[PDB]
Design a protein around this ligand. Structure first.
Ligand SMILES: Nc1ncnc2c1ncn2[C@@H]1O[C@H](COP(=O)(O)OP(=O)(O)OP(=O)(O)O)[C@@H](O)[C@H]1O
Ligand SMILES: Nc1ncnc2c1ncn2[C@@H]1O[C@H](COP(=O)(O)OP(=O)(O)OP(=O)(O)O)[C@@H](O)[C@H]1O
Ligand SMILES: [Mg+2]
Ligand SMILES: [Mg+2]
Ligand SMILES: [Zn+2]
Lengths: 643, 651
DNA sequence: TTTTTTTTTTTTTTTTTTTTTTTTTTTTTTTTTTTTTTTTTTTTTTTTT
DNA sequence: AAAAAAAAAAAAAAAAAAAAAAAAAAAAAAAAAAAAAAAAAAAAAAAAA
């Protein structure tokens, strides 16, 4: 229907004279600069934002979104033609593929014969000599689609979907152009690969071996060939977009090139790409017809909404965030912003913020002490333990939420599972691995299987998982902080029994928890009325009642916490005696009493990492005495409910 | 050889008959309206009741039920003509308009067991349960190619030869130009329709007991694909056909048969009800005319065969109506589902209340204490075993999403199962994970459970804690707990025995004529239509042997179903007077000194009790169709909670 | 309610059969057509009294 | 003027090679599926104050 020479001129015109004031208001050619950067081989990926294209040619954006594979090819053609005139120096040949490109180009010039018309097969395939790769960023005027509803009517179209990443293969080399050499001639043979399989060539087709009518067997080699970083992921529907009685649907996303190594399993992502078929020929197909599988050829992969990425590299922000972080009540404001719909539990929220920020990991002369804070909320029924855990799951960047026994066994640990790219046995992690450097919220901790409690022992202290079962012999790597929620021994605290007889945790597991918080709800008229007013306001308006400080948005909380995270403070010597005295005093009162939990050196280490976290929240580089004071006070408030 | 049919007399007559049946404008234009309606909401399949066709043209009806593809292609030509007449632009926007069939199939109503070879190429209705769905695959129906060498663009069409002979030239995908120039396919310009194969098994409760089940393969084409999922009880109407084998040279004479669906439908209990304008007028009249005591009128009319338990019936109405889910901006969730537990003495009609809600409520799932075990109750994770991948399997409480799980003998359920349902009973979701897959399935259900106390019978002289053998964590998420007690009072016995004996004497009018026995045996079911997928409604029941006589009527079951469906959608908003009353009420409930001595707590009072005060008040307001939660609603909620949460211990 | 043996039971495969599908594949005669002869039926230049 | 000749010269019949056309044409191997059974890990219910 349409003429692609004119479309190529259109996309050339867009690339050459589109400008924006992004550089601090200075008017830059957004894509000409990148053509410069990738003509000098300083850049590989060119993300063509289609919002930019739509500013001056919405019909082009419609055509792109309707074919989306013709236009990716057109854009690659156009940029490849524009690169020579944007090259202002000579590339340093940073790579080994670059040497092959340079030798091929130089040989082609050397035997040029510019006026002689060479065969269509006597040329280098375009894909063999590109070194860049071009991707679309979907127009924002396209509303994201739901994985279930991306069907045959959108094959070939550019669509945007979002879901949880459930499974990512390892990055492995996918052949793009298979290069062969001959045993007779000295020409190279190229076989661009489009299918998932290919039959390697046997005889060479070069001009010399045809003239000579020689054998000319050709040999497949990796050295001149083109591979691309390839990776296959499975992405899954979000829970709040599944039909009522249904399970979430998956989609295969084929990720190649510079989009690899972005998504990890557990990530919430938005993927823009072309919905494309794979011919699926070969089977003993029941039905006649050209049936095919489907996949999303990823163009843009964006983590989001709990695993947001770009803010991390954008730590520089407004003067405001400077002024709130500088404020003295910043710690109180961040603590209050944790689940504002839950009323009360101010100190619990302070401790939870400490778990999110965490302490500093020590590595002294090969004896690792982990800076993770593990917290257990040992509480009465209906005191909002699960709500706090679910909130912390929605907040923390790498967080997995686990209730009683749905995620038991290999749902926490790893399992060996078959792959598809290589058909061998890959290792897949469970909740403790999917939360490797984040939080794992274990709800109903007390009703957990004993094997899983043992695994949690070894995770909490050594921060690994040792498996020596039949198919698996590995030490997984689980650097997570455990946020546990449990009920006392008989579902409710019994003041007639002893504290550890209510906790029903062994001393070893009880010591694994830096802060173990008792939450009792004794009735009382004033506090019950206040709690009821808060709850009824939340029901009435879907928001917490207004207070003096507006709670921070969960994006701001993530950014503030992440900005705190890279702030390793050191305990000074001037605090050594103060900390030691606090620990000794705490230790003495532990056995002076008859209603105290197990206390050990881990209690000191808990003081020390809690105070390090508190110092970190103030963005200081040394721990002060107020941090140690706040750590001590939180440690007493953990059991304050007993009084 | 390529010929065209200059004149097919049969095709002409068939198309004329079908267009005549569809025009319908003189005969109260039902299909006229149906076609304009599918044009309106942008569909391209018309569901045609074969009873209407049998009325208008019986000869077509027989020909269509017996020669399915010929007649269906004629009828789809006629339908495209009709759509083009009504709207030519919409008609050109779709290449094909399909006709699905509906209604009563006499002997063409089968199960996967009785679907035999005497039905090949006939339209059949098959009922069963989905055992496996395939992936939804696109099948190319029109491939567009571009030759960069010559700038030419070609297109190649592929007819649906699924059940017809396919010669190998029919399925060649063009890769080269005639000059052997490489073609490249235009995926966004090519046309693909999506394709899916399911297997329908004979329903386990319909199959002969002890025999292995029988299945049928079913083909689903575009817009019919995602209509069923494994474990669904569906009705599939289609053509029964023998699939072509692969070009051989020797054949064993055996053909794979398959059902090519022309319509798929679910259990009609779970479908959106049809609402004639008179029905909406009647609902508005009901709600507006009787507003103070409408809730009690609906409640006492709930399970008419069960005498008494009026508070239990009010609570069950609240469960059927539900609170309103809160969806906070930060993603936090508060449930609007009401969970009810009945503990009682033997034979106090609590299994009967569970069964009534099973009959009445949409998406109600049964279960007994040990009939479901964890994985069978919540979801499961299995491995596909043919692709090597993890697969999620929905259990009872996922299938009951936006529905009810009616758990009976809840006490005899194992402790691990109740631990498993803790998370569903409050968060309305099932968190499940093996290592290759993790998911958070939606299970937004309300649990109606029946249990027996420890020792089988309730002990009046023991604390309800010592008598209900459940812990405060499990009890507290049951937001209403009713001790249904067998008191052997003689006047109560008068009342109950009278009611029961009166229910054991009633004959259904007309159907029963004096001595009839109801049963039918394994053929009589397929003889007539299924009252599970089948397509003037009064308001009050007429007086009969159910009741003697008085100045208070009985809401009809059908009207109550329609009314509850309408009222369930309402989202009454809590007012400030209601909020203050509920807050102070809850604060008073928590403080024990307000409640007498010798009166124990059946279940603990927590913040969940406040949430359930709100939920019950909201459900009451829904019943009145208020759009606001007024003080009467809050009072009814508080009195229900007050009745449920305390029991008098005797001595 | 901490410890402990049968029980499956989901997952790895392996077997393993039965059935459907796949893969492989020039030579040899015959016949029309054209271009030749060849006997016979004319027919067109030879001469006489 | 006709009477022998003595060729064309047309036909039927033959040959007579070509050069093209026409006519013959299952069994052996594989794979996939669906079903089994088996080693291992995992999840149940009987034990006692
Ligand atoms: N302090 C509170 N503020 C706001 N809401 C609360 C509070 N306490 C309880 N709730 C409400 O009560 C409901 C139950 O809370 P949740 O399920 O978190 O209890 P839980 O601590 O998990 O109890 P269990 O130990 O039984 O699991 C939630 O909807 C929550 O909103
Ligand atoms: N109040 C009542 N009104 C009408 N019928 C009743 C009543 N009480 C008992 N019945 C009759 O008793 C019979 C048994 O009732 P059901 O099976 O529901 O008892 P149950 O409470 O479930 O007993 P269990 O607790 O032992 O399971 C039913 O057929 C029911 O009709
Ligand atoms: Mg909880
Ligand atoms: Mg019962
Ligand atoms: Zn060669």
């Amino acid at each position: 229907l349409k003429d692609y020479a004119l479309e190529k001129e259109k996309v050339k015109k867009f690339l050459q004279e589109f400008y924006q004031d992004d550089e601090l208001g200075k008017k830059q050619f957004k894509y000409g600069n990148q053509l410069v950067r990738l003509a000098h081989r300083e850049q590989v990926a060119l993300y063509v934002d289609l919002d930019d294209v739509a500013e001056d040619d919405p019909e082009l954006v419609d055509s792109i979104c309707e074919n989306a594979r013709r236009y990716a090819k057109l854009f690659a053609d156009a940029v490849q033609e524009l690169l020579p005139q944007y090259k202002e120096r000579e590339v340093v040949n940073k790579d080994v593929l670059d040497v092959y490109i340079e030798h091929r180009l130089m040989m082609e010039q050397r035997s040029r014969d510019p006026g002689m018309v060479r065969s269509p097969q006597n040329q280098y395939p375009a894909e063999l000599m590109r070194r860049f790769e071009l991707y679309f960023q979907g127009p924002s005027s396209n509303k994201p689609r739901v994985i279930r509803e991306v069907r045959a009517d959108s094959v070939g179209k550019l669509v945007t979907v979002r879901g949880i990443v459930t499974r990512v293969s390892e990055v492995k080399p996918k052949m793009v152009v298979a290069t062969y050499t001959c045993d007779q001639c000295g020409a190279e043979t190229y076989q661009p690969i489009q299918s998932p399989t290919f039959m390697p060539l046997i005889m060479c087709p070069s001009q010399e071996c045809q003239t000579n009518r020689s054998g000319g067997r050709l040999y497949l080699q990796t050295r001149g060939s083109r591979f691309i970083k390839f990776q296959e992921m499975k992405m899954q529907e979000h829970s709040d977009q599944v039909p009522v009685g249904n399970i979430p649907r998956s989609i295969t996303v084929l990720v190649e090139g510079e989009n690899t190594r972005i998504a990890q399993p557990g990530d919430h992502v938005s993927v823009t790409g072309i919905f494309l078929p794979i011919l699926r020929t070969g089977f003993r197909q029941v039905v006649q017809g050209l049936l095919s599988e489907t996949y999303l050829e990823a163009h843009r992969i964006v983590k989001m909404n709990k695993s947001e990425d770009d803010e991390s590299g954008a730590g520089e922000l407004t003067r405001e965030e400077l002024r709130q972080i500088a404020e003295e009540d910043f710690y109180e404001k961040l603590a209050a912003s944790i689940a504002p719909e839950i009323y009360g539990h101010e100190d619990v929220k302070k401790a939870l913020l400490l778990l999110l920020v965490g302490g500093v990991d020590q590595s002294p002369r090969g004896m690792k002490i982990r800076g993770n804070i593990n917290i257990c909320l040992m509480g009465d029924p209906g005191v909002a333990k699960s709500q706090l855990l679910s909130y912390i799951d929605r907040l923390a960047p790498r967080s997995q939420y686990t209730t009683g026994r749905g995620s038991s066994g290999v749902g926490l640990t790893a399992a060996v599972l078959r792959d598809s790219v290589s058909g061998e046995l890959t290792l897949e992690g469970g909740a403790l691995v999917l939360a490797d450097q984040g939080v794992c919220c274990i709800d109903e901790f007390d009703k957990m299987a004993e094997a899983d409690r043992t695994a949690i022992h070894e995770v909490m202290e050594q921060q690994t998982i040792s498996i020596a079962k039949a198919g698996i012999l590995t030490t997984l790597n689980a650097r997570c902080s455990i946020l546990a929620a449990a009920n006392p021994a008989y579902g409710r605290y019994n003041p007639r029994r002893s504290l550890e007889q209510n906790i029903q945790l062994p001393a070893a597991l009880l010591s694994r928890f830096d802060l173990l918080w008792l939450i009792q709800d004794r009735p009382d008229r004033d506090n019950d009325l206040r709690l009821a007013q808060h709850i009824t306001y939340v029901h009435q308006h879907s928001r917490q009642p207004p207070s003096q400080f507006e709670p921070l948005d969960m994006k701001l909380m993530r950014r503030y916490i992440a900005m705190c995270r890279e702030k390793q403070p050191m305990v000074p010597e001037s605090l050594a005696d103060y900390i030691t005295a606090a620990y000794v005093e705490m230790r003495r009162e532990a056995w002076a009493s008859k209603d105290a939990t197990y206390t050990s050196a881990r209690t000191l280490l808990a003081i020390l990492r809690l105070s390090t976290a508190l110092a970190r929240l103030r963005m200081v580089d040394v721990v002060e005495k107020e941090d140690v004071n706040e750590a001590i006070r939180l440690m007493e408030m953990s059991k304050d409910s007993l009084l | 050889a390529g010929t065209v049919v200059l004149d097919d007399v049969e095709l002409r007559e068939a198309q004329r008959d079908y267009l005549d049946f569809l025009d319908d404008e003189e005969d109260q234009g039902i299909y006229q309206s149906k076609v304009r309606e599918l044009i309106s909401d942008n569909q391209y399949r018309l569901i045609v009741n074969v009873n209407d066709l049998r009325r208008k043209n019986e000869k077509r009806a027989n020909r269509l039920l017996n020669n399915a593809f010929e007649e269906l292609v004629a009828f789809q030509r006629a339908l495209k003509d009709f759509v083009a007449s009504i709207d030519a632009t919409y008609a050109k926007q779709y290449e094909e308009f399909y006709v699905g069939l509906e209604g009563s199939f006499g002997s063409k109503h089968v199960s996967p067991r009785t679907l035999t070879s005497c039905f090949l190429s006939c339209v059949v209705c098959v009922e069963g349960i989905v055992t496996k769905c395939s992936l939804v695959r696109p099948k190319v129906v029109r491939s567009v190619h571009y030759c960069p060498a010559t700038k030419k663009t070609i297109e190649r069409r592929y007819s649906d030869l699924t059940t017809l002979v396919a010669f190998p030239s029919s399925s060649v995908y063009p890769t080269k130009d005639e000059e052997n120039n490489p073609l490249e396919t235009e995926y966004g310009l090519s046309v693909y329709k999506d394709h899916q194969t399911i297997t329908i098994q004979e329903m386990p409760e319909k199959a002969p007991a002890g025999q292995l089940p029988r299945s049928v393969d079913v083909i689903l084409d575009d817009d019919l694909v995602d209509k069923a999922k494994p474990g669904d009880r569906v009705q599939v109407v289609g053509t029964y056909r023998c699939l072509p084998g692969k070009k051989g040279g020797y054949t064993s004479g055996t053909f794979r048969t398959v059902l090519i669906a022309c319509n798929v439908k679910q259990m009609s209990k779970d479908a959106q009800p049809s609402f004639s304008a008179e029905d909406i007028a009647k609902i508005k009249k009901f709600s507006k005319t009787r507003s103070k005591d409408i809730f009690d009128q609906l409640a006492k009319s709930l399970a008419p065969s069960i005498h008494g338990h009026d508070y239990v019936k009010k609570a069950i109405l609240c469960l059927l109506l539900g609170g309103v889910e809160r969806d906070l901006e930060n993603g936090s969730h508060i449930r609007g589902d009401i969970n009810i537990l009945l503990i009682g003495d033997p034979s106090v009609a609590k299994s009967q209340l569970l069964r009534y809600v099973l009959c009445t409520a949409p998406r109600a799932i049964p279960t007994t204490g040990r009939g479901s075990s964890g994985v069978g109750l919540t979801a499961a994770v299995t491995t596909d075993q043919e692709t090597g991948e993890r697969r999620l399997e929905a259990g009872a409480m996922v299938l009951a999403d936006r529905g009810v799980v009616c758990i009976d003998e809840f006490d005899k359920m194992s402790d691990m199962d109740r631990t498993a349902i803790h998370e569903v009973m409050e968060q309305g979701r099932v968190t499940i994970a093996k290592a290759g897959i993790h998911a958070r399935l939606n299970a937004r259900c309300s649990v109606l459970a029946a249990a027996n106390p420890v020792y089988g019978r309730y002990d009046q002289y023991k604390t309800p804690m010592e008598n209900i053998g459940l812990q405060d964590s499990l009890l507290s998420r049951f937001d209403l707990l009713f001790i249904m007690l067998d008191q052997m009072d003689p006047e109560q016995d008068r009342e109950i025995s009278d009611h029961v004996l009166r229910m054991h004497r009633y004959r259904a009018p007309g159907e029963q004529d004096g001595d009839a026995m109801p049963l039918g045996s394994a053929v009589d079911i397929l003889a007539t239509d299924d009252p599970n997928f089948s397509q003037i409604y009064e308001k009050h029941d007429n007086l009969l042997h159910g009741t003697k006589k008085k100045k208070e009527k009985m809401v009809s079951a059908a009207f109550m179903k329609k009314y509850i469906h309408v009222a369930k959608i309402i989202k009454p908003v809590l007012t400030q007077e209601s909020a203050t009353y509920i807050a102070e009420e809850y604060s008073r409930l928590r403080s024990q000194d307000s409640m007498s001595s010798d009166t124990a707590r059946t279940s603990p009072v927590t913040a969940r009790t406040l949430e359930t005060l709100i939920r019950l008040a909201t459900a009451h307001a829904k019943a009145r169709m208020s759009k606001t939660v007024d003080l009467q609603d809050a009072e009814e909620a508080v009195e229900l909670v007050q009745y449920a949460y305390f029991k008098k211990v005797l001595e």
